[PDB]
Ligand binder design. Structure first.
Ligand SMILES: [Zn+2]
Lengths: 177, 288, 55, 63, 309, 106, 135, 214, 37
């Protein structure tokens, strides 16, 4: 995460300092995939609109990443997972693509835990993009409740003294003057 | 040596904050008038009931230095006594006060004159140049001891208390609250923090005494003072006052409430500065 | 019970589903925060109006 | 629902079991929320008035 | 220099008394500085036996627009003023005290009079207005100080109101503090009738040596126990009353400001309305800093005792 | 970064600072904030742009007013009333002009 | 807390039965015993259930709740009764009064200890004076 | 009168011992009032018993001084059989240790650490302990918690002294840290006052310079 | 929430300091001084 943020900052700086005004295709791909990782859909869409069509035509991987981003925008998790695992990502894109996969998994897990008191097993499996039974065992080891008769899943929803004293002193000093 | 050894207090002395304030005012004004902290001399008045002496008020006496001796204007003292008779009669003369450190061979003569005036005078000395946290006020009585075959008057320290009323308590508490406030605002939290600093120091000194006693008991002393060290250990086990979710709930509840009140106070101060800025700006360039 | 609550004699309310009478204990004894909040908003809006008019 | 929209009923409609629950909100939670909103608005208006002094001290206007 | 104010310059006082700058301006004297000694003595006299109506003289000096009170003392009152005024054997006592002080050191002369108002507020009644007007005739300057012993318990603190009268016929140009005080039904009538015939001075206490002495003594003997809960301010009658009073003061300020926008060229309104805004803000700030100090002592002690180790 | 900071000192540009630049800056900043889904700051910038005292009509000003209407509809669900701190002929001529956005708001 | 064994001697003493002219109100002896038992419960028990309170008082839960309500009505026992859960909340001193008294008791016990060492061991006081003078 | 009886037993132990000393220990453990046994442990005759053949009574006394009820239950064979008073006193000591360690005692801990099968018996023992001025506190039956405001301490002769010294040192270090923190804040307040003062004479100097200019 | 309140504080304190700085700058203006003198 922290390394990904540093890489995103470096790529943004490189884009801002591009000599000919056009960054290398690896930099653009890293920028787009890292924007997808942080769920920053607006920035990813604007960057895709900024990219000239020449790069898109010469690099179908960029088009695949944009299709994955569009799937993320529509939030169709089964389609998102299918599209991510369908296109081969280069050595500079595969690890960050898997990080995006993990982030999507965690996001869907949290959304199901929060919004869904009860959810169908098939619906949960589609949301997590994983088969039903091992998802059931994974949520059972997660301390959740599952009903086998109705195939319903019941998720379980889950300043130091020095800083204070400095704030208290700033209370008096502001009011002292 | 003008101090008696092995002599215990025979009477109980009660002192009021008014006497301390009068002594302080006399010392401060005499310092301001004549440079160095010139020694002051005054008199003590109040009510005496048998062996219970209550010093409620104090006033000043005129003194002159002749032949390197302080001569109290006892005629002035009697004139002012009759003057006080016109305002308060229940108050009777009890003794005299002065400022300084340990008794000097000049206060003995003054106390001799005051004992020549009345039956049993009280001697009080205040130390305005003290450095410890204790009260620099001591009350001494007149005792006659046979030193080298000659009767020499000595001073015996009295274990005096400090008595006050509800009225004086409230008034002095108000004056303390005023001293919290500064000129515009000279020092407001400084006195507050020193006030808690003294309280923590008082408790810190008590902990040192207990810690030293345990260390001595480990080597010598009584191997076990019984109910004391047993209880001392119990108070080290009661030291971590266990807090539950509700207490931290309420503690954070109180902090947020007044913290919001503190935020409101800052906003009120800020808008007044903005209002002053707007008023000055409307005259700087703007018309109407 | 309904008649008593209508007469303001009872500081409580009725849960008919469970055959229940729940009384508001009102043990907080506050309502000072309500006065503080009204004082806060009225004068801050007063300050905003004054600043806008003076500028 | 219409009465709640207009007011003077102070209620919540639990349409699951069809039970009408009265609303009794704590004053402090509402007070803190709107006090924070006031402070944000006060800061925003502080910025705006602060901005206004810029165009007048530096004589900024449409010619 | 903390002790500089204690220096008495007789020639300088004579020069000021010969100059009489107060004759050039009826609002000349604006500040009243009171020694911790004089405050304590006047509050102690005022408290006396519960709620006694008593009075005395104040010794001090003048410095620019500031009146300085250094000391105070009382006068004999046989049979609780059985004669006219609270004086009886007053002249004799006063002169004796003056000469005695001149000898023992005190060279400060009469600067004013103080008296107490047990549980009715700090203000000047018709009698006190006439007294301070006569105190503006003889003894050119003079200031009327009013104390509240029963409000030192009720309000908890209470200020020692310092006042000066306007000469007969003279109108305050615009002076309007709009300060609210709770006055009993049998006293509010007279209060409202003579309230504009005088003005209030700003009372201030130079951080000297007598003041910090008392603060130490109390917090080293009686207030040495800094527990007592931590907030007697929790009882929401004093803060809430100050909060409600602050709300009313600014509400009236807006009502005057709204009506003052139609009148173009009313300078008096501007000064007074801004004066109200300033005074109201300070009252809130002083209340705010008091509560902040309350929690600061709370936090340091509470954090220590509970989870030190 | 540089838009999240309040910049309360306008430069005269030695008298060459035309308030057209002020209007352009506020309109473009509001558009940028709208692009980043920061509707509150976009609405604030649009409101500040509207309140600029101008004696003539400009297309940038009209577009700022229209975007203000759109952002007010998005965020608060209604058109926020223009302050009595006010402006000049700007509002007087815009209100007739931007009638379609007022119909959309209605 | 009062058991049923002190009843006999007091009843014998009263008026070879009960004081005044008998009692027959379940004995005034037992009325006072139950009242003082509920007082002692209010001293310790922050809250109590109906069955456990009845077992403590050796009476049916209905009798216990009725007597508790009667005592609360007369102002002799503070608290309130919830009939759903069967829990009578005798006393709840928020969080500040409980904390203040504990600190005050802690400080008082510190002062009691310090006095005990000074009195029972004057040599410690001499050692304390020597220790404070050395540092 | 517990202290006087304990002192009398101490004086007697300086002389008669052996079988008589075991009888005295049994009387101590059976007589109510003695909540502290550190006075007896330091007597030289206790050490004589330590080198003496008899050790069951000495182990019982050692467990009463340091151990708790579960230790006695585990040592039910090596210790002399207790009476009702001895068992009640040991349970009181265990509750005292629990309260001293942690103030709000859940009922589960009380049932587990004291072999309490019936909660009514637990209530009876708790009220008996409180009424004999051993522990002061309040009971929360709805939450099944035992809030203890104050409790007595235990014996300290051999190994707890180091913990006490460590606890005292931590308290001393904590007090010094707060004292240093208060001093730093006071210095900061003085600096703010100086900065506020420094801003002041600059204004008057700015004012006076213009007055001289005009 | 306490941290957020303290964060708004530091913005207000800095805002007040900037307001005071301008007010001092206003006092430097001769026009205010000419009316004052
Ligand atoms: Zn009067």
């Amino acid at each position: 995460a922290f390394s990904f943020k540093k890489l995103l900052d470096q790529c943004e700086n490189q884009e801002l300092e591009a000599p000919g005004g056009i960054a290398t295709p690896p930099v653009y791909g890293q920028l787009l995939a890292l924007y997808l990782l942080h769920n920053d859909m607006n920035n990813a869409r604007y960057l895709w609109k900024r990219i000239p069509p020449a790069i898109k035509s010469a690099n179908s991987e960029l088009g695949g990443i944009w299709s994955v981003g569009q799937r993320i925008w529509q939030r169709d998790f089964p389609g998102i997972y299918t599209t991510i695992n369908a296109h081969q990502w280069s050595e500079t894109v595969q690890p960050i693509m898997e990080a995006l996969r993990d982030a999507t998994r965690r996001r869907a897990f949290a959304l199901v835990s929060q919004a869904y008191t009860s959810i169908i097993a098939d619906d949960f499996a589609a949301f997590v993009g994983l088969p039903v039974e091992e998802a059931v065992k994974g949520i059972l080891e997660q301390g959740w409740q599952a009903d086998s008769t109705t195939r319903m899943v019941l998720p379980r929803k889950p300043i130091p003294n020095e800083q204070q004293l400095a704030r208290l002193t700033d209370y008096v000093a502001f009011l002292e003057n | 040596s003008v101090m008696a050894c092995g002599v215990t207090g025979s009477v109980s002395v009660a002192l009021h904050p008014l006497v301390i304030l009068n002594i302080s005012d006399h010392w401060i004004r005499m310092r301001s008038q004549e440079g160095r902290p010139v020694q002051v001399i005054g008199a003590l008045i109040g009510k005496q009931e048998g062996r219970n002496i209550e010093v409620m008020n104090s006033f000043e006496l005129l003194s002159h230095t002749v032949e390197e001796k302080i001569i109290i204007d006892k005629e002035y003292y009697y004139t002012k006594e009759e003057q006080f008779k016109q305002v308060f009669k229940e108050l009777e003369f009890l003794g005299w006060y002065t400022t300084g450190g340990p008794p000097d061979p000049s206060d003995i003569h003054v106390h001799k004159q005051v004992c020549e005036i009345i039956e049993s005078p009280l001697f009080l000395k205040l130390n305005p140049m003290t450095k410890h946290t204790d009260l620099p006020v001591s009350v001494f009585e007149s005792v006659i001891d046979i030193i080298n075959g000659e009767a020499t008057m000595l001073f015996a320290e009295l274990t005096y208390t400090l008595a006050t009323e509800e009225a004086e308590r409230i008034g002095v508490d108000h004056v303390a609250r005023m001293t919290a406030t500064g000129s515009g605002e000279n020092s407001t939290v400084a006195e507050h923090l020193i006030a808690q600093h003294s309280a923590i120091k008082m408790l810190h000194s008590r902990v040192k005494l207990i810690l030293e006693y345990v260390k001595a008991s480990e080597a010598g002393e009584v191997p076990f003072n019984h109910e004391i060290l047993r209880e001392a250990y119990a108070l080290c086990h009661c030291l971590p006052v266990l807090s539950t979710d509700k207490f931290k709930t309420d503690f954070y509840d109180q902090c947020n409430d007044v913290g919001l009140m503190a935020y409101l106070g800052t906003i009120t101060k800020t808008c007044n500065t903005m209002n002053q800025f707007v008023n000055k700006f409307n005259v700087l360039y703007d018309r109407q | 019970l309904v008649q008593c609550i209508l007469d303001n004699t009872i500081h409580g309310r009725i849960d008919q589903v469970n055959q229940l009478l729940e009384l508001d204990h009102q043990k907080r004894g506050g309502a000072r925060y309500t006065a503080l909040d009204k004082w806060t908003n009225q004068l801050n809006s007063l300050n905003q109006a004054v600043v806008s008019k003076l500028a | 629902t219409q009465l709640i929209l207009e007011g003077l009923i102070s209620a919540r409609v639990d349409s699951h079991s069809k039970i009408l629950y009265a609303r009794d909100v704590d004053q402090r939670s509402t007070t803190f929320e709107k006090s924070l909103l006031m402070g944000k608005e006060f800061q925003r208006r502080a910025k705006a008035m602060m901005l206004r002094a810029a165009v007048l001290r530096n004589q900024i206007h449409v010619k | 220099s903390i002790d500089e104010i204690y220096k008495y310059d007789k020639k300088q006082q004579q020069e000021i008394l010969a100059a009489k700058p107060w004759t050039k301006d009826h609002h000349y004297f604006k500040y009243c500085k009171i020694s911790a000694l004089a405050l304590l003595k006047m509050v102690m006299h005022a408290r006396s036996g519960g709620n006694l109506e008593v009075m005395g003289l104040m010794l001090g000096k003048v410095d620019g627009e500031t009146m300085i009170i250094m000391d105070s003392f009382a006068l004999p009152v046989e049979g609780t003023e059985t004669r006219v005024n609270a004086q009886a054997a007053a002249y004799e006592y006063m002169a004796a005290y003056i000469e005695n002080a001149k000898q023992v050191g005190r060279l400060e002369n009469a600067i004013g009079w103080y008296h107490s108002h047990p549980g009715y507020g700090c203000w000047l009644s018709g009698i006190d207005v006439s007294t301070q007007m006569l105190n503006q005739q003889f003894q050119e300057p003079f200031v009327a100080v009013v104390i509240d012993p029963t409000r030192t318990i009720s309000a908890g603190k209470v200020n020692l109101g310092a006042f000066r009268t306007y000469p007969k016929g003279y109108k305050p140009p615009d002076e309007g503090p709009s300060e609210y005080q709770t006055i009993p039904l049998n006293k509010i009538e007279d209060f409202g009738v003579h309230c504009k015939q005088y003005y209030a001075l700003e009372v201030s206490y130079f951080k000297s040596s007598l003041d910090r002495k008392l603060l130490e003594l109390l917090w080293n003997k009686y207030w040495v126990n800094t527990l007592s809960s931590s907030s007697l301010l929790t009882n929401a009658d004093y803060t809430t009353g100050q909060v409600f009073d602050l709300s009313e003061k600014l509400e009236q300020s807006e009502a005057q400001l709204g009506r003052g926008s139609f009148m173009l060229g009313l300078e008096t309104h501007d000064r007074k309305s801004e004066d109200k805004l300033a005074k109201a803000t300070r009252d809130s700030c002083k209340t705010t800093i008091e509560a902040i100090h309350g929690l600061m002592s709370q936090v340091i002690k509470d954090k220590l005792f509970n989870q030190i180790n | 970064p540089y838009l999240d900071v309040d910049m309360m000192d306008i430069c005269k540009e030695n008298g060459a600072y035309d308030a057209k630049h002020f209007l352009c800056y506020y309109y473009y900043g509001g558009m940028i904030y709208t692009g980043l889904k920061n509707f509150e700051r976009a609405l604030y910038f649009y409101e500040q742009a509207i309140t600029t005292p101008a004696m003539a009509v400009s297309h940038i000003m009209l577009e700022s007013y229209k975007k203000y209407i759109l952002v007010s509809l998005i965020l608060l669900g209604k058109v926020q009333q223009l302050p009595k701190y006010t402006s000049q002929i700007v509002g007087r001529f815009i209100k007739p002009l931007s009638n379609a956005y007022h119909e959309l708001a209605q | 807390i009062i058991r049923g064994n002190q009843l006999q001697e007091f009843a014998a003493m009263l008026m070879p039965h009960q004081k005044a002219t008998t009692a027959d109100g379940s004995s005034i002896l037992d009325r006072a015993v139950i009242e003082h038992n509920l007082l002692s419960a209010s001293k310790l028990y922050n809250n109590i259930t109906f069955e456990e309170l009845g077992a403590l008082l050796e009476i049916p839960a209905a009798k216990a709740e009725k007597i508790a309500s009667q005592m609360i009505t007369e102002g002799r026992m503070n608290g309130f009764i919830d009939q759903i859960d069967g829990i009578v909340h005798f006393e709840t001193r928020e969080a500040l009064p409980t904390w203040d008294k504990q600190i005050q008791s802690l400080c008082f016990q510190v002062n009691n200890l310090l006095e005990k060492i000074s009195q029972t061991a004057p040599e410690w006081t001499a050692q304390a004076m020597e220790a404070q003078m050395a540092q | 009168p517990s202290s006087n009886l304990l002192e009398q037993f101490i004086l007697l132990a300086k002389g008669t011992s052996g079988s008589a000393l075991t009888a005295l220990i049994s009387q101590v453990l059976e007589a109510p009032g003695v909540y502290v046994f550190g006075e007896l442990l330091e007597l030289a005759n206790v050490q004589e018993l330590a080198e003496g053949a008899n050790a069951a009574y000495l182990q019982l006394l050692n467990l009463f001084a340091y151990g708790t009820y579960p230790d006695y239950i585990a040592n039910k064979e090596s210790l002399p059989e207790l009476s009702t008073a001895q068992q009640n006193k040991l349970k009181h000591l265990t509750i005292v240790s629990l309260a001293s360690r942690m103030k709000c005692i859940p009922y589960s801990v009380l049932l587990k650490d004291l072999e309490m099968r019936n909660l009514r018996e637990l209530e009876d023992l708790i009220i008996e302990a409180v009424y004999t001025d051993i522990i002061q506190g309040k009971l929360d039956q709805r939450n099944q918690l035992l809030e203890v405001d104050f409790c007595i301490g235990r014996d300290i002769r051999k190994k707890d002294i180091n913990n006490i010294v460590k606890t005292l040192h931590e308290w001393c270090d904590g007090c010094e840290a707060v004292l240093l923190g208060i001093e730093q804040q006071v210095l900061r307040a003085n600096q703010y006052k100086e900065n506020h003062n420094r801003t002041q004479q600059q204004v008057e100097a700015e004012v006076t310079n213009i007055k001289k200019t005009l | 929430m306490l941290h957020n309140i303290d964060q708004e504080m530091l913005k207000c304190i800095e805002l007040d300091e900037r307001l005071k700085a301008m007010d001092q700058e206003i006092t430097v203006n001769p026009q205010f001084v000419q009316k004052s003198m």
